[PDB]
Design a protein around this ligand. Structure first.
Ligand SMILES: O=C(O)c1cccc(NC(=O)c2c(Sc3c(Cl)cccc3Cl)cc(C(F)(F)F)[nH]c2=O)c1
Ligand SMILES: [Cl-]
Lengths: 10, 402, 132
């Protein structure tokens, strides 16, 4: 899921 | 004292025609038609006063839809040709609006597709557009400027050492935030790099700026508030801390700064003082996207829902269900919400209906638009079109005018 | 300070300088012509008192709507005074009031509101009607 550098959580 | 008085006849009789014209300028179209048929002198006042021209001009001044059509259709050239020309034009404009509104409701559009032709790391994380250009930020570390009309690439800006995650521009500067944890400032005309802000400890995920101030936010869980005296003179005013995970998006106006985070919350801050105001709770997973204007906050979440909020009391006014994956970008105007999801789909929502608690939920999603083959990262829209970009390395222009 | 206004009748009103100067016209006569008192040949005492009352209160709300519950002849005189004195605020609410009496009505209902005779020929009316 980290293949999206634009958003993050945790 | 006379009981009754024909204002519209009496005023021109005394050499005060403009007062009579000003009274009639307040009429809506249908009442202006009625006024025309009251009597010959009323007709003459409306006709010699060019009231239909003034009515179209008042619409262009007060309604971006009418303004956009004046430019796109070319009849705006005649504004600011006899009175009868504008009277005959007015119903054509109405019909034009109706067909545009119908195209939205029914999903009828033309489509332009830019292939960004990224050599290695594909995808377009962010974008902003005007009538001249599309400015786009890419996972290959560059900013590409596209000609809005010819769809050709007019400029590539290099300098970031990671993905360009967020961007905004105005008449003077482009400001970009990057996975390389920096904010950069570029000249919108020449592309020359003018400034670099070293501050955040992790990827800069979002930024907004306006009227001499900027807000930035980061995977490092902080928000930075900046004062911009000029492209080259930018000072840190305050750091806002309190989020327990990455801050994915920030928006603001003169009342409030609004931030949202992987920690499942929206936080509201006082723009003047930078003091915490309140937390908006309710999403069941992290928040991926947000826009804030007036009193309305609209947020999109990993929980696959959209929420509408009043900024003053923090109440959630409406939950929008229907997306089948993470809601990754969202915008709204006066009529619609437009949202994009991880499954490549874009949805159009009826914002008025959504803000009316009588309306049932199933009537709220107006259309689903399926033309991307990857996650939708960013979109912007107006009365006539949507511009969207995706992990699939394309930018789409969805045009509802024809 | 107070300045005396002199109505077309001759009745003189003492008015505070800051109330008076909402009329640019009266302001010009004070500041540029240095006139005292200020003659107003186009405004009689009855309308002038109505105008002074409106200007003090405002040093289109609900109070103005109640203030404008007068016959059309008086509203017409008020429009003229507001024009002559160039009190844009008063001119706007009175003009908006007339527009509100026009909007949402058929031509026949407008005529009846203002006591206006329909003077179109049948041919002329049909033509005007065809063009809507
Ligand atoms: O404890 C629970 O009940 C539970 C159980 C399963 C899942 C979750 N939630 C999430 O996995 C999640 C992710 S994942 C992710 C990441 Cl980290 C990076 C890039 C892309 C993605 Cl999709 C991202 C966000 C956002 F804030 F970014 F939007 N929010 C979230 O909630 C919670
Ligand atoms: Cl997680």
């Amino acid at each position: 899921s980290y293949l999206d550098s634009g958003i993050h959580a945790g | 004292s006379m009981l009754q008085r024909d204002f519209i006849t009496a005023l021109p009789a005394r050499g005060l025609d403009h007062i009579a014209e000003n009274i009639l300028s307040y009429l809506d179209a249908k009442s202006l038609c009625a006024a025309e048929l009251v009597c010959k002198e009323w007709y003459r006042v409306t006709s010699d006063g060019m009231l239909w021209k003034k009515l179209i001009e008042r619409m262009v001044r007060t309604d971006s839809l009418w303004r956009g059509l004046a430019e796109r259709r070319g009849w705006g050239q005649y504004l600011f040709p006899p009175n009868s020309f504008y009277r005959a034009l007015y119903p054509k404009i109405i019909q034009d609006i109706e067909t545009i509104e119908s195209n939205w409701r029914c999903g009828r559009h033309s489509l332009q597709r830019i292939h960004c032709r990224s050599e290695t790391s594909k995808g377009v994380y962010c974008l902003q557009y005007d009538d001249q250009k599309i400015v786009s930020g890419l996972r290959d570390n560059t900013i590409k400027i596209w000609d809005k009309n010819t769809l050709e690439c007019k400029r590539i800006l290099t300098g970031h050492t990671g993905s360009v995650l967020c961007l905004q521009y105005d008449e003077r500067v482009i400001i970009t935030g990057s996975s390389d944890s920096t904010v950069r400032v570029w000249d919108v005309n020449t592309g020359e790099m003018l400034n670099t802000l070293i501050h955040h400890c992790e990827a800069v995920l979002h930024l907004r700026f306006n009227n001499g101030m900027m807000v930035t936010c980061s995977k490092d869980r902080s928000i930075a508030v900046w004062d911009m005296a000029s492209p080259t003179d930018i000072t840190l005013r305050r750091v806002l801390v309190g989020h327990r995970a990455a801050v994915n998006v920030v928006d603001f106006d003169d009342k409030y700064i609004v931030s949202a985070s992987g920690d499942r919350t929206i936080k509201v801050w006082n723009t003047s003082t930078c003091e915490f105001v309140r937390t908006l709770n309710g999403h069941k997973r992290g928040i991926a996207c947000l826009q804030y204007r007036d009193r309305l906050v609209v947020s999109g979440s990993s929980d696959n829902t959209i929420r509408l909020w009043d900024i003053e009391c923090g109440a959630c006014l409406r939950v929008l269900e229907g997306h089948e994956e993470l809601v990754r970008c969202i915008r709204f105007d006066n009529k619609r919400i437009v949202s994009g999801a991880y499954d490549g789909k874009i949805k159009v929502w009826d914002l008025v209906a959504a803000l009316d608690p009588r309306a049932p939920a199933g009537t709220l999603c107006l259309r689903t638009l399926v033309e991307h083959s990857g996650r939708v990262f960013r979109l912007q829209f107006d009365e006539f079109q949507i511009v969207s970009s995706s992990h699939d390395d394309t930018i789409l222009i969805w045009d509802f005018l024809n | 300070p107070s300045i005396k206004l002199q109505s077309s009748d001759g009745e003189i009103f003492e008015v505070d300088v800051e109330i008076a100067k909402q009329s640019v016209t009266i302001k010009t006569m004070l500041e540029d012509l240095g006139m005292d008192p200020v003659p107003l040949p186009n405004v009689n005492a009855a309308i002038l008192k109505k105008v002074i009352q409106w200007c003090t209160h405002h040093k289109i709300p609900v109070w103005d709507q109640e203030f404008l519950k007068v016959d059309q002849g008086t509203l017409f005189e008020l429009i003229l005074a507001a024009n002559y004195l160039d009190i844009k605020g008063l001119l706007d609410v009175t003009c908006k009031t007339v527009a509100n009496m026009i909007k949402g009505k058929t031509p026949e209902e407008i005529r009846k509101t203002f006591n206006i005779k329909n003077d179109f020929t049948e041919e002329e009316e049909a033509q005007v009607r065809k063009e809507n």
